[PDB]
């Protein structure tokens, strides 16, 4: 509360560490569905159904331009990518399976790096 603060958790490396995690996600062999924004002109249904599209290139641009206020808003965008994928793709599709695999990959890096 006013003039009463919990001890300061050191966030000075968070930008660098999120950038490293994102590089590892970018270079994963199953990242291909997620590298670029879904083309809203060429994929019927996507625009109407997926209210907040997100992809790795958009996260990378946001990360590089100071648009994440903290490491949690970064994780929310990463999870959005996989939540969108699960909304639109059958679990037993190449893209659906990619999204499950990547989510697992991310969440392990996240816990290992920060928790």
Go through the domains of the chain in sequence order and give each one's CATH number.
Answer: 1-115 (1.20.920.10)
45 Rama sector, left if φ>0, alpha if ψ -120 to 50, beta otherwise: left
Structure solved using which method? X-ray
SS3 36: coil
DSSP category for residue 45? T
Q: Residue 41: phi, psi to the nearest 5?
A: -80, -35
Strand, helix or coil for residue 98: helix
For Cα atoms 80, 20, 64, give the angle at the middle one, nearest 5 degrees. Answer: 70
Where helices occur in the chain by DSSP H, the ranges are: 14-27, 46-49, 56-64, 71-88, 94-114
């Amino acid at each position: 509360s006013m003039s009463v603060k919990k001890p300061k958790r050191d966030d000075s490396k968070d930008l660098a560490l999120c950038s490293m995690i994102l590089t590892e996600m970018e270079t994963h062999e199953d990242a291909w569905p997620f590298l670029l924004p879904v083309n809203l002109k060429l994929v019927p249904g996507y625009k109407k159904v997926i209210k907040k599209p997100m992809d790795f290139s958009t996260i990378r641009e946001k990360l590089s331009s100071g648009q994440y206020p903290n490491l949690e808003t970064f994780a929310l965008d990463v999870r959005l990518v996989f939540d969108n994928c699960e909304t639109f793709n059958e679990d037993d599709s190449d893209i659906g399976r990619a999204g499950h695999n990547m989510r697992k990959y991310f969440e392990k890096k996240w816990t290992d790096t920060f928790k």
